[PDB]
Design a protein around this ligand. Structure first.
Ligand SMILES: [Fe+3]
Ligand SMILES: [Fe+3]
Lengths: 197, 197
C-alpha cells in the first residue's frame, strides 16, 4: 500500500547541479529503500492502514526512521525542479523579504545552516506559529512536523549520499548548486496551504 | 597543536576492499579537515594545550565533534591493514570464542549492527566493565571512552563517506569487504592493554 511517489521531472532534470547518477541512487535506491523497509515493518501492526503523515506523527524507532525519510525525500524532490532556482517570486518572495530582511539574508543564513550541520540531516524553511518564516535544522530523519516546530515550505537534504557522487566532501558546492534547483512554486503552494493552517 | 598521525600503510594498501580514492578523501580530506578544524576551535582556549584524549573526555559541542572524529578515525585506520583480515588469532580469537560462542557469531552480530545503524556513526568491539567483549554502536562522533561504556579494541566507520565512492548505497558490501582488512594484531594489543585496565 505505501508507494514511492513519482518524481515530477526526469532523472536528468537537475543537471549539472545534481547528476542523473545521483538521482538514480538517491531516488531509485535510497528513497525506494525506505518505502520497501516501511512496508516490511508495518505489514501486520496498527500502522498498516494509517497514512504516511499519521505514521510519521505516531511512530518511533525504525518505523519512524523509514516513514519520515520517505516523506522528507518526497518533500525534497518537490522542493526542486528544472527551470527553477535564482531569485524567489510570488508570495514567498514577499515573505522572505518581510521575515529575513531580504532574499540574500535568507540564502546566506540557510547556506550556513546547511553547511554546518554535523552528521546526517536536513535544513528547512518553515512557517512557525507567529505566521513567520523560520530556518530549522533536523538531524537524521527528524522533521518539523514531528517536532511541532513549524509547517515545512522547503527542505534540502544534507546526508552525504545527496552530494557525495558529484561533490565528494565538498558540501558547500552542493549547497551553492542547489540554489539553481529551488522550486518557488512548490514554496508558494506550501505557504498558501500553511497560512490556511 | 594536534597532528594527523601517519597511516601505517600506503593509500592503496586496503584495495580492492577500500579503494585508493576513498582513502584519499577519507584520510586526506575528512580526517585532516577534522585536524585543521579542531586546531582553530581550541586555538585560544583552555584546551589549546591538552591531549586529543583529554579534549575527547572533557569537552562538548563542535570541539567534541572534531576531536572525537580525529580520535575515531586514527582508531579506524589502525583497526585495518594489508595482509590482515581472515580469522582472528591468539588472545582475541580465544576471547571472542568465549564471549560470543565463535568467530562467525561475532562477525554476523557485528555485521548486523554495522548495517543496521541509521544515519552517521561507528561500530565498536569493546571491553566492557564485566571484562566481557561486547559490540557497541555510537552515533555521529560518539565513542565508548566518553560514554564510559567500554575500552575500544576495534572500530569500523559507518558514515556514508567511508564507503559511498566504492559501494554507493550498498553498506553491506562495504561491511563484507571490511572483514578482509581487520587488523587482529591491533585488536590483540588493545585487549592486552585493556585487560591490564
Ligand atoms: Fe537522502
Ligand atoms: Fe569517516
Amino acid at each position: 500500500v505505501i508507494t514511492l511517489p513519482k518524481l515530477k521531472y526526469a532523472l536528468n532534470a537537475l543537471s549539472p547541479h545534481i547528476s542523473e547518477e545521483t538521482l538514480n541512487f538517491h531516488y531509485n535506491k535510497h528513497h525506494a529503500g525506505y518505502v520497501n523497509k516501511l512496508n516490511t515493518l508495518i505489514k501486520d501492526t496498527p500502522f498498516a492502514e494509517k497514512s504516511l503523515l499519521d505514521i510519521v506523527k505516531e511512530s518511533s524507532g525504525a518505523i519512524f526512521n523509514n516513514a519520515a525519510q520517505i516523506w522528507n525525500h518526497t518533500f525534497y524532490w518537490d522542493s526542486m525542479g528544472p527551470d527553477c532556482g535564482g531569485e524567489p517570486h510570488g508570495e514567498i518572495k514577499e515573505k522572505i523579504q518581510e521575515d529575513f530582511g531580504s532574499f540574500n539574508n535568507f540564502k546566506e543564513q540557510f547556506s550556513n545552516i546547511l553547511c554546518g550541520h554535523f552528521g546526517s540531516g536536513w535544513g528547512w524553511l518553515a512557517l512557525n506559529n507567529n505566521n513567520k518564516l523560520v530556518i530549522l535544522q533536523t538531524h537524521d530523519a527528524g522533521n518539523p512536523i514531528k517536532d511541532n516546530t513549524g509547517i515545512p515550505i522547503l527542505t534540502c537534504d544534507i546526508w552525504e549520499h545527496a552530494y557525495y557522487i558529484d561533490y565528494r566532501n565538498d558540501r558547500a558546492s552542493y549547497v551553492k548548486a542547489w540554489w539553481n534547483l529551488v522550486n518557488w512554486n512548490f514554496a508558494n503552494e506550501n505557504l498558501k496551504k500553511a497560512m490556511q493552517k
